Design a protein around this ligand. Structure first.
Ligand SMILES: [Ca+2]
Ligand SMILES: [Ca+2]
Ligand SMILES: [Ca+2]
Ligand SMILES: [Ca+2]
Ligand SMILES: [Ca+2]
Ligand SMILES: [Ca+2]
Ligand SMILES: [Ca+2]
Ligand SMILES: [Ca+2]
Ligand SMILES: [Ca+2]
Ligand SMILES: [Ca+2]
Ligand SMILES: [Ca+2]
Ligand SMILES: [Ca+2]
Ligand SMILES: [Ca+2]
Ligand SMILES: [Ca+2]
Ligand SMILES: [Ca+2]
Ligand SMILES: [Ca+2]
Ligand SMILES: [Ca+2]
Ligand SMILES: [Ca+2]
Lengths: 217, 217, 217, 217, 217, 217, 217, 217, 217
């Protein structure tokens, strides 16, 4: 009946010392490219970090984030190897509490960054982590921004809302491929690095496990 | 590929002030009967409480527990409306770290208690909560014993190990029905009160979300 | 998913002035024979009337009842045209709170009465309403005994428990046919006089609408 | 043959001390969003409350209602956390005694309210329960307006007519999803909070259980 | 081979003391709406009553009739609670001896009357039995007009011809639903109040039982 | 759903001037053999004539009958060309009100008579209408014995009970063929002379049209 | 392989005392309407009678005939109750030796006559046997005109050619229905009064039994 | 529905000058072997000739016949090229009016004759038309014995009864093959010389065309 | 793999005393119409007779022939009852050595002749054997013209080439039917008089048996 890809996690809200988050048990391998796709229902307009990857020597190896502009426009950001946050605007009005499919595509081979909203390209940006290779052993945390491996969280950088169908590949997916990932009734692909609910993660500080009805009612 | 019924939660180990546990978001309705079935992989021989249900006036409405005797024999216990713990031994040697299907069947209509290990009856006991009806609004916690709604946990009463496929019905399932519930390749029924991964729950204090390989490799 | 034949009604318990019951909206046609089959989960051992049919001139046209003997043996009774209650014992131990399929077969053509438990014949009795034809316009009430059309209920004659799959035919089904009616995975026949959930009925005094798990979990 | 989703309940008419209604046995979990969809056949033009949710400290947590304007236009109302009733008109002429699919979509995350008639959007309204989260333990009553948990009904606020296929989700369904819910020959989705005939409810004061022929004859 | 819905009854012709007719064995439940559909082959142009429903205190609860105007136009009439006969003309030329599908839709909730010929709407009429509810226990006679329960027939009000596929619902079917009922190769729906050949009836005064070839040759 | 072969006719009881019966519209062709099979539920033990065939010059061309002996044994009789009634006893105890399949096989070619109960041979008799050929134009009446074409009925020769699946062939079916006719879940053959519900017949004096549940519930 | 509906009979030619013909063994029931359809291959242009029905008091109850006009146009005639022959011309050129589907539709209810050639309407005629009902017991002869039951044939009124697929109904088929009867690859319907090769008939005076290749080669 | 192989012909009885018979339109080719199989229902015990083949110079080329001995035993005869009749008795009691499958196998190559009853071998005979080859142009008549091509019939040599499924091969079928021919539910083979209803024949002197119910009811 | 309908016979060339030909073993029945269709590959332009039918008193009962005009145009001829050869030109250029489907349609009923090339009509001719009926017993020879039964061949009238799929019916097929016969991928019909390779024939004077690749390679 209910597919495992539709399981969702709710990140209630953050307030020191409570930081709802997930931390994947297995560290990532070294990667030269990364595509992070997932379904999200944001609870606030201000900036929040969703996917955070940190190594012993670099707490900011790869970090995705978002925020909603005053006009309701979605802004997707990416930070690689402690670079400044690179933002790309998406031509879609965000209604807090509604579901959206978001994907960040990064390639250190050519330094190209691209983001997608609901399976459609929002635009690209050059010189983002160009020539950079994320060293092996990266620890992934969801919902909080790491300043130390698995910790050093800050409430102003947390992301509250609901998340599901997190899929990560160590390749830079094409525009066409991202649309096949977003499709609710599509093949619903599984990442080779992280496949939602197939790669163990620690749940802490009151996250809520439930079901997402973005695709199936 | 992977069925949502095979999702598992690991309860690492308890040590104040850390109490890994789950708390279901929705309270239970009033019930005169209850059957709690689930797959478990115990980490220790000493007594631990698995399913704990509490109301404002009675923190001990319904509590399941287990422990392994010196000879390796499984003992399943039940406590209803603050009664003493009633234990029924099962003719099966327990190996910590291995999977077992356990089910507790309770009927307040006739006061009969029955427990099952791997789909087979271990025995029954009379006068357990006879004539008792669990009042509406019971809060369910997994892995810890409540002394207060959603809290008042005690390390000596915690249960560590892995749990999956939790199914709860507000009826007293028959011996034959329990065997159809336990079967790995059977129909894998879903409880009408609580259906694993279909009824939201809060995850806290470091529980680990993963996949159970008791049934499917 | 869930079949309408598995919908159940719970009759909580009776205490003046509260009499949980059902009353069918349409009166029955004249009949010379009647077979009443249904799934029941009794809450008490003392006598209770399940199916009650009354006309303006005869509040006791056809009434089914049951009670459990001291040894746990099931006793099924029938009363036709204000006759005395005729009881036939069934070779099955009743556990209050458990499901059982019960059927009463009556034929006014030859005056024969026969009852069945879980699809098996318990025995027969002669001279029960022999030559009697239930006059047209009978009102059917479930869970209470009528002393007046749709009323005049008495607490000591009420039946508490859960009921489901009520099927009524204006024929006297054979022993073989009743076994095909009882089978949980059988064709699950629908009565031509009353078909569960296909013939409207008034629900009153706190009956609970839910699902029966006697057949499907 | 007949699907459980087509079972209907008739609310005859209210007159103190008789208040036909349904009360769900299980209280709701805490929610920040809610979508209530159902098929209704109204018996009167004046205002009536259909879905009423109340907690110990707030009898008016969430209440749906409707009324027909002088020109026959349908007006759908919603009240959250004791706010005033917010009404949105639907471009459809109502004929008392005819079936219509109605749905109320509420999101406390952004405070947006939206209503649908026969699967089509009627319009939206801002600032309805914005930032409000319905506290856990809400009791749901159908057909009457609660002034106390499960009671305190008032004849002038009751709703008479026929109701079927009640489905409730703790999410704010999109315009497209509501159309898939309304379709008679569609997938006929089941709510995750309340699924018609899958979540027990008490029937009282003469409600009539029957079959709806809005979709299947 | 031959479906039961195609069985037909021929009403030869009436002449005191012979009144060919059918009388259903079971009385109807109370209804606030009624839809009567059937296939008919009229033998005469003058007015004849087809469906007659009577209670102890009202011999004219619900009566359908028809007649052919001078120009061959079909006129369908309805009388509710002893009101005057309300007629609606149908844009179809009637050839005595030919088959036609006729349906009468009545709603006491809004007092709306609508008739259909061969699955197409002929028109509607307001204020027909508005607010009227047919009391329970109505006796249905086909082919004759009752002035007394099951009798008091009058030759000048009888209807001669062939009739088949009589289906009655206690709801006011929509225009679209009536077209699905009329279709010869459609689903051929069965009424919930009266389903042709599934609800017993007395045949008297020389009616002829045969097969209708309106739909299948 | 319901097959036309399961339609049944009830012959309530006879009392001058009321003689419930059926009369086939079409006369039979000349035949030198005849097999009459049907399902019957007898209401009385005394002799009654079921199938009566008469021509202008011979009201007793072919007549079937039955009666139950004191010990409950079934006796099947046949009369051809005004011969005396020939009876053959069947090894089966008859319970009034129960269904039985009965068939009469007659061959004027060799003058052999054979009867069957529930598809099994009861025995045979020689010299019954040997060399006799039923002249063309025979009128068939069911439930009454003709002393004149379509009339001259006598209450003491009437047959009361329920009848269904009447099949007549102008051949003398073999013992094996009769068993294939009786089988409830068999091919359910249709006679070439008279096929139940496919050959028109007049219904008179209050016969009741309904459904037989001998084979399908 | 070969369907029974394609069996054909050849009427060689008539010359006293030889009159090739068929005579149905069973007489017809009383009818107020009649539709006679069949496939024919005419051997001559002059008038010939195909279907002849006679009763003791009326040798000309119903008679069909045809003839080819000088320009090759087909003329179909009908005579009812000894009326004069009514002819309707068909817009089709007849080639002796070729197959054609012909059907005569008659309704005594309204006195309308209609004929069809190859499934298409040729026209209609009023006042043909209006109000007339063919009395029961009509004997049918094919290929000759009866002046006496089964005889009194006249060579100048005989019809020579090949005939197949004779289907007769006691209803007045519609224009659309006749087209479905004529279609060679259609459902090939069977009449309820006479079904080709399913209703026995005497063959006499040298008719030839063979196969028709009008539809299947 | 009805297969052409089940069409039957009835030979009523012979009485000069009336000789019911069939004569095949096409003469046979020269053959050195012949197998004649068919289903028959005999009307008399005395000798009758069924299949008669004659050429200009030999009216007795091949003739089959039968008769029933005093003890009811079937005797099958064959005559080839004016030889004396050769009889082989079959171990089966014949009941006039019942169906039997009979087959005659002849081989002029070795002069062997073999007959079968109901698919079983009755025995063989040597020196029957040994070395004889039936000359080309043989005319086949059924039911009468030819003394001249297509005529010269004699009442005392006629065969009365019913016949169906006549199949003729110009080969000497084996014992096993004859059993596959006789089987009612088998492949029902068609002869290469004469295939029932596929080879034209003249019907004369009152034969009756109908349907055989030996195999299908 | 290879269908019997594609078997071909090659007629090498004729030179006294060698006359390659085929002679069918069985003579034809009497016919009033005849259609002869077959596939041919001609080896010469001069006239040749393909199908020759002769009786004792008429060696020229029915004869088909062809020849190619100077411009390459195909001419098809027919002779009936010793009439002169009637020729109809076909709008197709013939290439000796190539395959063509040819069919001759003759009707003695109206005296019409029609020929077809490759399934298309070439034209018709009147007064060809009008009123003539080919007497029974005709012997068919292929490839030579008979002046005596099965002989009297003349080299100047022989036909050389390849022939296959010879199909003969005793009916006059329509234009449409001939097109369905010619189609290589069609149903490939089989004549009822002569079916290629299903009706035995003598092969003599060096004909060559092989396979035709006109339709299947
Ligand atoms: Ca950081
Ligand atoms: Ca930080
Ligand atoms: Ca506690
Ligand atoms: Ca504790
Ligand atoms: Ca009483
Ligand atoms: Ca009482
Ligand atoms: Ca309130
Ligand atoms: Ca209130
Ligand atoms: Ca009246
Ligand atoms: Ca009146
Ligand atoms: Ca008599
Ligand atoms: Ca009598
Ligand atoms: Ca005449
Ligand atoms: Ca005449
Ligand atoms: Ca002879
Ligand atoms: Ca002779
Ligand atoms: Ca010649
Ligand atoms: Ca020559």
């Amino acid at each position: 009946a209910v597919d495992i890809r539709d399981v969702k996690i709710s990140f209630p809200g953050t307030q020191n010392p409570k930081f709802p988050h997930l931390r994947f048990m297995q560290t990532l391998p070294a990667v030269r490219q990364l595509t992070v796709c997932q379904r999200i229902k944001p609870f606030h307009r201000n900036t929040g970090y969703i996917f955070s990857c940190a190594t012993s020597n670099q707490d900011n190896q790869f970090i995705t984030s978002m925020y909603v502009k005053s006009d309701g426009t979605l802004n997707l950001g990416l930070q690689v190897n402690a670079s400044s946050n690179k933002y790309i605007s998406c031509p879609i009005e965000i209604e807090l509490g509604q579901w959206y499919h978001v994907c960040h595509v990064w390639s250190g081979v050519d330094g190209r960054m691209a983001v997608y909203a609901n399976g459609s390209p929002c635009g690209t940006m050059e010189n983002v982590g160009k020539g950079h290779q994320i060293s092996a052993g990266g620890t992934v945390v969801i919902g909080q921004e790491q300043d130390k491996i698995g910790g050093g969280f800050e409430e102003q950088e947390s992301w509250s809302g609901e998340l599901s169908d997190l899929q990560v590949w160590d390749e830079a997916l094409t525009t066409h491929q991202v649309s096949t990932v977003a499709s609710c009734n599509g093949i619903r692909p599984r990442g080779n690095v992280i496949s939602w609910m197939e790669d163990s993660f620690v749940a802490d500080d009151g996250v809520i496990v439930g079901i997402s009805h973005m695709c199936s009612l």
